[PDB]
């Protein structure tokens, strides 16, 4: 009854109380454009974009100094009075500010593009209540490999439906020139943190256009039914196919994706520590280049119920450390019959420098007995004895239960691998001598003639058995061994006047299987199997001095001293009658080849040269 | 004196000016529930939850279309007039919205659970001024390994006091059925970014229930006096104990934690690049399974003043690359006397495929001379000569100063390791031939009879010394070597009519210790140590052709040509009188074993076959 | 015309309507300090700091309980009426709250310091529209290695211009005592996420003071023309130079930086997976310590058009896995002529335990033919035959096209490496026997005398050719081999009464080059090259039993049985007439050295002992 309208009250600014009250009633963008500020620099809150679009709200301040900026329908809203309202924001741009459909019904790429332009490429898609749909490539601003920008595409749980045969994210400067042979790239991008990229699986969905996006860190994202995380099919620069360059795919959750990388060539590629579940294909870089892949690392990934993890071309400097493979039987795996393909395979070039360490190749039952299956398939270049240029791959400490871990005969060095249900011999690969319980030893010892020369018999070597006797078990002590005793006959000043080499064979055996009366002493029998010496050769062309034949039909004798054995040769006559004087010593470089296999578990025979 | 009450002024909405003014006085949640909106879709700001609870404030809009939603005391607040007020938020849920005690006095798990339910598992705990206490497991929504969700538990520095024997975070669908043998799991979780999990050290605190949380990335968090980051004790599926599956613990700050992982079985486990200070235990997965651990990687960790870093059972495909151990002497280390335990140890099964690369085992003074200490303790399965199934672990490029790096006699392949203050021999392990300065060479050369056959003497091999002479130092030149000359006698069309092998021993020596008159030429003396040839064997059952004895008591002669040496055998008579014709050449596959040890620093003798 | 001033309307709080209206007109900090709250606990919005400073706005509530807190010009603003206004914030502190110049014109370090103090070291710099300049070190609060804090320096794209010779970020407790020899450190820091650190390149810019900041994760940042990411030059504790401790530099974008790390000593250093473009220097830790670096890992980095990647001192437990080097020719590289320098070089100590796996050393054209260039330069300690203490570095699976991959003669173990355009021999390094197509085999077989003794001829070994015949290609079958047959003569209860060893040489050859009439059978010829046996040695000192000479001038014969070959020795007489009885069997531990080189691509000869 007692009612005074607020329009009859005047605020000190000159505007009515009704106009002051109206600044708390700004629900939509249209309400702001129809609102006139009461003071200069006023900040008001707009609730949402429209009555149907519940996102896009925020604070807007009337920039009284700006009378020319255009309305962009997101961060600069121009009122009917001409007031330039500008959104207050110091973080990442939200495509919802510009009207991106958070229900996933319509293509929001144009609105995502608007958020890219005002944020210098730093876009954030919000929480899990939002689901966006992008069907048009969005271009990131141009930033060279040495540029001053850092771009990010991230979120707080939102979902992005992807519809693109080439990549919903690319370089802005390639838009309109998508098929250009020029390097229209942009670099330095973090993408995926807090984002769920998803495809429907019945159409093409590519997230990153690898033709145009270099130096990319893809981490922390979920990818579901995505045809390819990265794709590149555009020839440019020195390449006749598309290629990817400096892409790191790490710590993601991949599921039901057709490919991780889809291209023909790669530079500095990393795909490590990703949880991949039921993916139909991994890293495909199977072009015919020399090489196709310049460095790839695939470490600590999970690859379960999946297809071919990597179908690669020629690979230089490849590493695959600690991957987890379990029950993979889909995608191209039933046809290629391998988890990894390297060069050369078919038209592909030869690989060079690839190392597999600590992988588990847990096979589905179908490939345990498939004679045409190998975990890693390739052809090495072995027609020449020299392997300098095209180094075949090596395998260290891996575990498989498949028919084969690699193509038979294509690997030269491998140790520590496990072939559960199969055998190493089937791979036609060399076995390291260590796994045959063969160990090598060596020593250098000087035998002065004044001490080790009696009646033409010269001591040439000394071995010890004291550590053999120290072993606890009788069955560990015995061993056999070869000896290469390189003898250099020298004067007092170490001038070499002669040279020879002896080949000796040994057997070491003590008490074995004996309780009462057993001893720790172990005995050696030696036999001179070979001998050769130089009988000539000018070593001093000024004074006419030649290497001297010091031994005349030598015979080997050994003598036990304590626990040691002195090996000696007969028929010794020292050189003399020259500028350098007489031979004062025999300097012996002894190298032993010990065969440790005995009745016990000894892997290294403890005989050694002193 | 001149006072008109605001209740006598009417706003265009129909409500009084006093009611318009009241929308700026909403301090607590009770003020909002007692407030009636002036327009439809009005957004007002609530300052805090109550007069005592200073958090939980935010913007709320009157959803005029909603007349049925229930009050949840956090994001949907229903007023006395029936207005459904809904919080404006597009980011992560804050448990403080629902009343989580930010002082750490009362259990806030129920409020954390409320934030989980409305955020699809994306909870954020705020800044370092907050300290929460959780004593009841909070369950994350169900998401399979191929599910469409990505969940996160993160913060901006807040602290969470943990009180749980099983894990404050688990799967929601396991709540009420915690002891179920079914796989009531949920997957895809990022946890720890910007969060400080802390226990009091006098009670049980577990962060992640590994029985129910799979595909977990634990990164960026601080953990202080936490009994276990991950624990799993519930048997399920094919396992008779609890197990962890696809857990990655990376880039965290661990201090005074009792265990990193506490279970008996593991699948696809990663614990890398964590700063661990004074932790009493690391990765414990020491069940009796075959195996206990299916792939584990522990790389680049810091482990100082700590206990046993890893007490594991049987491990398949294990890798430990580049860890940093320094002065560890607490926890179970004084009893187990090792930094890492592998299978087999006690009841545990045998390991297969484990590689240690580039670790530093910096011991406390107590374990440098402890004969019962080894950095890595295990028992290998060496009763058979074949090591295909149970591949013993290998060690490459590690550094220790402890008594032992591994259990004596249990390692077959190891190179590049450093045993400061100790010795390699004490490990009873084979020494690679490369470390004994032994190098291998090989060549294939054809010696046509028309060129290399004079009076029954046939040239069979050719070695060169030109690169020996090229060496700068005299002491590097000399060497000795063995020769395996596999000779295949072939016709013009490369039909093999005979086969033999010669064993040759060589010594190479030139000027050494000589100034005036020295020459670069080095001389070779050879000796035929062994010879054998095939004298029969049907190779053509249709025409009745057998392998022919080409040599009759051969004698070895050598001839110096330039810098090369031609090795020749006598008593040669070519095969003839058959369908294939006469022997036209000797095709020699020469393999050399070079013993490089001399008076200099030569590690590879530069004699080689041509 | 009909105008009632708002000052004549009274709100229920007792304040006039004009004062109520004024709470929506608070543009600057001065407007808030001049504003009096209408109710207790009122929250008002301040638009910005001043009319010229457009940042720093936010919500402030009148804390009626606080009458003593001082104004800090950022989060606590005290009004003229004495009202303590406190900013509502539960996230990271913004230096703009305190007036940090977002245009980069003036030093904002004092304002950054204010944000550190109120956030417990959790500072956030905002979006790419901001560019700050810091010229004074900002100190982080004290937190020990076992402390309860987690600190972060991050942003949302902002740029920070860096001007500091020591580090714009350091420990607070070192300020004023910067040259102290005490360990005035603080630990647990995440720095760089969403931040662009930039220098002008004509002055000193260091981001992290490594003398005072330990346990640092530097990830996700862009660094442009920064003199050093980490620098440490202050001697302290047991060190005579500065050092870095537990610094991880991972997943960054480095460009045109002078150094990554600039110091003389390091502990637990990680520099992995960084995109480095045109950087003039990497990890410099080249002090004379023993060692200089306690564990360093540099994995998966990009290093293009850059300088020396790592000039290190003595390194213990170093790893370099999978780096990508391409066309580096600037910085110190033209003078040092290497990509990596290790100890010893010059005054630097010797390294021990360093492994290079899977790197690509892609050289600029200038270093392909430079005889003074090597990818990794160092001097190994090879004056002694024993390499236990100072283990030389090893190289596995790397790829280079430079003149050398390492300093000649300084590497002992290396395999799988590629030397495009060069050769392995030039490195003066041993070649693993596997690359020479040499493979080892072994077996243990018991030959009971009742079965394998006829007329003094005793079967001592059995080899099989069945798998040789199984090979598809004729050229793959043939091979030669050595045999070490360790024979232990035992009684029925396995008491060793004798021991001997035979050296045998073999040649295996079948049909080769033959179509019609060819057979799969392959034939063996054996020759006894060496033999030795023990003829004495007390094994039972109680009963006076010695090892017995079982063989009297033995002659080797072989017999083909199916596909097997039985090797036999003559002159056998069993021991007898003692407490243990007679010799009942010959237990043979056979170890074979197979030389697989033939006319085909065989790398492992398929002869084996049974
Ligand atoms: Zn409206
Ligand atoms: Zn962002
Ligand atoms: Zn109240
Ligand atoms: Zn979040
Ligand atoms: Zn003003
Ligand atoms: Zn933060």
- How far apart CA A361 and CA C145 sit, in angstroms, is 40
User: In this structure, how many other beta carbons lie within 10 angstroms of the beta carbon of residue C103?
Assistant: 10
Chain B residues near residue A385 by CB distance under 8 angstroms: 442-444
Nearest ligand to the C-alpha atom of residue C51: 5
Instruction: Looking at the complex, report in whole angstroms how far the Cα of residue A166 sits from the nearest Cα belonging to chain C.
Output: 25
Window B:378-397, CB contacts with A under 8 Å: 382-383, 385-394, 396
The verdict on a CB contact (< 8 Å) between B479 and A499 is no
User: In this structure, how many other beta carbons lie within 10 angstroms of the beta carbon of residue A455?
Assistant: 7
Q: State whether residue C466 is helix, strand or coil.
A: helix
The verdict on a CB contact (< 8 Å) between C4 and B4 is yes
C105's tokens: 């014109």
Binding residues of A for Zn(2+): 156
Distance A51 CA to ligand 1 centre (A): 7
Chain C residues near residue B360 by CB distance under 8 angstroms: 294-295, 316-317, 353
Among C270, C311, C316, CA closest to C291: C316
Whether the CB-CB separation of A546 and A533 falls below 8 Å is answered with no
**Sheet hosting strand C76-78, strand order edge to edge:** C43-46, C58-62, C84-87, C76-78
Report phi then psi at C371, rounded to 5: -65, -20
Whether the CB-CB separation of A378 and A349 falls below 8 Å is answered with no
The verdict on a CB contact (< 8 Å) between C534 and A412 is no
Mark the breaks in chain C: residue after which each occurs, C to N over 2.5 Å: none
The verdict on a CB contact (< 8 Å) between C222 and A150 is yes
Q: How, if at all, do strands A275-277 and A253-255 pair?
A: parallel
The span from the first CA to the last CA of chain A, in angstroms, equals 119
Window A:392-451, CB contacts with B under 8 Å: 396-399, 415-420, 422-424, 432-435, 437-442, 444
- How far apart CA B340 and CA C317 sit, in angstroms, is 17
Nearest ligand to the C-alpha atom of residue B195: 6
> Which chains lie within 8 Å of chain B at 3 or more CB pairs, if any?
A, C
SS in 3 state form for A480-493? EEEEEEEEEEECCC
Is C12's Cβ below 8 Å from some Cβ in A? Answer: no
Whether the CB-CB separation of C349 and C400 falls below 8 Å is answered with no
Chain C residues near residue A145 by CB distance under 8 angstroms: 255, 275, 277-278
From residue B524, alpha-carbon distances to B145, B257, B441, B568, C610 in Å are 69, 66, 17, 14, 39
Instruction: Looking at the complex, report in whole angstroms how far the Cα of residue B596 sits from the nearest Cα belonging to chain C.
Output: 9
**β-strand partners of B341:** B311, B377
Elucidation method: X-ray
Instruction: Looking at the complex, report in whole angstroms how far the Cα of residue B356 sits from the nearest Cα belonging to chain A.
Output: 10
Name every residue whose Cβ is closer than 8 Å to that of residue B472 and which is 6 or more positions away in sequence: none
Biggest distance spanned by C-alpha atoms of chain C: 142
Distance of CA B199 to the CA centre of its chain: 28
Which of A399, A423, A488 is opposite residue B353, by nearest beta carbon?
A: A399
The verdict on a CB contact (< 8 Å) between B220 and C190 is yes
Among A44, A129, A57, CA closest to A99: A57
Chain A residues near residue B23 by CB distance under 8 angstroms: 24
Is B51's Cβ below 8 Å from some Cβ in C? Answer: yes
- How far apart CA A569 and CA A460 sit, in angstroms, is 7
Whether the CB-CB separation of C522 and C562 falls below 8 Å is answered with no
The verdict on a CB contact (< 8 Å) between B424 and C388 is yes
Nearest ligand to the C-alpha atom of residue A22: 1
Among C518, C507, C522, CA closest to B495: C518
Is A516's Cβ below 8 Å from some Cβ in C? Answer: yes
Question: To which residue do tokens 């295996």 refer?
Answer: C508
Among B457, B465, B503, CA closest to B483: B503
Chain B residues near residue A218 by CB distance under 8 angstroms: none
The secondary structure element, H or E, covering residue B40 is: none
The verdict on a CB contact (< 8 Å) between B12 and A18 is yes
* Total residue count of chain C as it appears in this document: 610
> What single DSSP character describes residue B239?
-
From residue B236, alpha-carbon distances to A556, B181, B203, B283 in Å are 70, 4, 27, 21
- How far apart CA B423 and CA B403 sit, in angstroms, is 9
Report phi then psi at A467, rounded to 5: -80, -30
Q: How, if at all, do strands C259-263 and A522-533 pair?
A: unpaired
**Sheet hosting strand B281-285, strand order edge to edge:** B138-140, B169-171, B206-209, B228-231, B259-263, B281-285, B308-312, B340-341, B376-377
Chain A residues near residue C2 by CB distance under 8 angstroms: 8
Distance A216 CA to ligand 2 centre (A): 15
> Which chains lie within 8 Å of chain C at 3 or more CB pairs, if any?
A, B
DSSP assignments along C253-302, one per residue: EEES-SEEEEES-EEEEEEES-EEES-SEEEEE----SSSEEEEE--S-E
Window B:339-378, CB contacts with A under 8 Å: 352-355, 357
Residue of chain A nearest B444, judged by CA positions: A385
Asked whether residue B156 is marked as a ligand-binding residue, the answer is: yes
Q: State whether residue A33 is helix, strand or coil.
A: helix
Nearest ligand to the C-alpha atom of residue A26: 1
Q: How many alpha carbons fall within 13 Å on the CB side of residue C509?
A: 34
The verdict on a CB contact (< 8 Å) between C92 and B127 is yes
The verdict on a CB contact (< 8 Å) between A275 and B215 is yes
User: In this structure, how many other beta carbons lie within 10 angstroms of the beta carbon of residue B294?
Assistant: 23
User: In this structure, how many other beta carbons lie within 10 angstroms of the beta carbon of residue A496?
Assistant: 25
Q: How, if at all, do strands C457-464 and C608-609 pair?
A: antiparallel
- How far apart CA B502 and CA B482 sit, in angstroms, is 10
Window B:132-161, CB contacts with C under 8 Å: 156-157, 159
The verdict on a CB contact (< 8 Å) between C435 and A412 is yes
Task: Using the Cα atoms of residue B453, residue B455, residue B460 and residue B466 in order, give the sign of their dihedral.
Answer: negative
Name every residue whose Cβ is closer than 8 Å to that of residue A55 and which is 6 or more positions away in sequence: A48, A49, A94, A96, A102, A126, A130, B90
A446's tokens: 């000087």
The verdict on a CB contact (< 8 Å) between C150 and B224 is no
Report phi then psi at A33, rounded to 5: -60, -25
Q: How, if at all, do strands C138-140 and C84-87 pair?
A: unpaired
- How far apart CA B126 and CA B119 sit, in angstroms, is 15
Helix, strand counts (H, E) of chain B: 6, 49
Window B:576-595, CB contacts with A under 8 Å: 595
Name which of A186, A217, A218, A268 to mutate to probe chain C: the one with the most chain C Cβ atoms within 10 A of its Cβ: A268
Among B10, C385, C485, C382, CA closest to A21: B10
B85's tokens: 């007020």
Q: State whether residue B467 is helix, strand or coil.
A: helix
Residue A562's region, left for phi above 0, alpha for psi from -120 to 50, else beta, is left
Helix, strand counts (H, E) of chain A: 6, 49
> Which chains lie within 8 Å of chain A at 3 or more CB pairs, if any?
B, C
Chain C residues near residue B205 by CB distance under 8 angstroms: none
Nearest ligand to the C-alpha atom of residue B93: 4
- How far apart CA C126 and CA A108 sit, in angstroms, is 26
Instruction: Looking at the complex, report in whole angstroms how far the Cα of residue B349 sits from the nearest Cα belonging to chain A.
Output: 15
A362's tokens: 């847990």
Q: How many alpha carbons fall within 13 Å on the CB side of residue C310?
A: 30
Resolution, given in Å to one decimal, reads: 2.4
Chain B residues near residue C319 by CB distance under 8 angstroms: 321-322, 357-358, 397
Residue of chain A nearest B10, judged by CA positions: A5
Mark the breaks in chain B: residue after which each occurs, C to N over 2.5 Å: none
């Amino acid at each position: 009854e007692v009612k005074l309208p607020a329009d009859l009250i005047k605020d000190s600014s000159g505007k009515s109380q009704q106009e002051v009250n109206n600044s708390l009633k700004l629900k939509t963008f249209d309400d702001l454009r129809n609102f006139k500020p009461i003071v200069n620099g006023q900040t008001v809150y707009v609730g949402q974009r429209s009555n149907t679009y519940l996102q896009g709200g925020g604070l807007f301040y009337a920039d009284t100094s700006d009378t020319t900026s255009l309305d962009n329908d997101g961060t600069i809203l121009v009122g009917i009075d001409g007031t330039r309202w500008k959104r207050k924001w110091n973080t990442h741009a939200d495509p919802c500010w510009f009207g991106a459909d958070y229900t996933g019904t319509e293509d929001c790429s144009a609105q995502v593009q608007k958020a890219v332009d005002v944020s210098y490429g730093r876009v954030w898609f919000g929480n899990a209540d939002r689901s966006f749909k992008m069907m048009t490539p969005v271009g990131l601003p141009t930033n060279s490999i040495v540029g001053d920008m850092l771009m990010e595409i991230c979120g707080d749980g939102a979902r992005v439906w992807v519809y693109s045969n080439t990549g919903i994210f690319t370089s802005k400067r390639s838009i309109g020139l998508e098929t250009s042979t020029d390097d229209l790239y942009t670099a330095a991008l973090e993408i995926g943190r807090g984002l769920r990229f998803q495809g429907d699986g019945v159409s093409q969905s590519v997230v990153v256009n690898g033709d145009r996006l270099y130096n990319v860190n893809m981490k922390g994202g979920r990818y579901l039914r995505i045809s390819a995380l990265v794709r590149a099919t555009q020839p440019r620069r020195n390449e006749t196919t598309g290629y990817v360059q400096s892409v790191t795919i790490e710590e993601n959750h991949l599921a039901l994706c057709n490919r991780i990388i889809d291209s023909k060539r790669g530079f500095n590629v990393t795909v490590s520590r990703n949880f991949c579940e039921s993916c139909y294909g991994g890293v495909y870089l199977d072009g015919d280049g020399s090489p196709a892949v310049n460095v790839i690392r695939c470490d600590g990934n999970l690859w379960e119920s999946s297809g071919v993890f990597a179908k690669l071309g020629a690979v230089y400097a490849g590493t695959f450390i600690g991957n987890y493979f379990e029950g993979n039987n889909t995608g191209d795996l039933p046809t290629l019959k391998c988890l990894i393909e390297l060069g050369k395979t078919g038209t592909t070039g030869y690989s060079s420098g690839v190392t597999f360490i600590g992988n588990q190749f847990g096979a589905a039952a179908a490939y345990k007995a498939d004679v045409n299956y190998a975990d890693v398939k390739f052809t090495a270049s072995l027609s020449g004895t020299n392997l300098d240029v095209l180094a075949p791959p090596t395998f260290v400490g891996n575990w498989t239960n498949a028919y084969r871990m690699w193509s038979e005969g294509q690997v030269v060095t491998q140790f520590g691998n496990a072939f559960s249900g199969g055998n190493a011999r089937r791979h036609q690969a060399p076995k390291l001598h260590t796994e045959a319980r063969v160990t090598f030893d060596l020593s250098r010892k000087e035998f002065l003639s004044s001490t080790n020369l009696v009646g033409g018999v010269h001591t040439v070597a000394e071995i010890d058995t004291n550590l053999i006797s120290n072993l606890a078990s009788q069955s560990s002590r015995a061993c056999t061994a070869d000896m290469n005793i390189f003898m250099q006959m020298k004067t007092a000043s170490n001038v070499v006047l002669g040279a020879a080499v002896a080949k000796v064979s040994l057997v070491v055996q003590g008490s074995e299987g004996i309780g009462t009366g057993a001893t720790t002493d172990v005995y050696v029998a030696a036999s001179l199997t070979g001998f050769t010496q130089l009988e000539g050769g000018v070593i001093d062309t000024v004074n006419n001095v030649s290497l001297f034949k010091h031994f005349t039909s030598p015979v080997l004798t050994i003598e036990r001293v304590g626990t040691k054995y002195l090996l000696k040769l007969s028929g010794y006559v020292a050189a003399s009658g020259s500028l350098y004087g007489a031979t004062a010593k025999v300097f012996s470089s002894t190298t032993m080849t010990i065969y440790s296999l005995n009745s016990g578990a000894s892997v290294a025979g403890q005989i050694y040269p002193t």
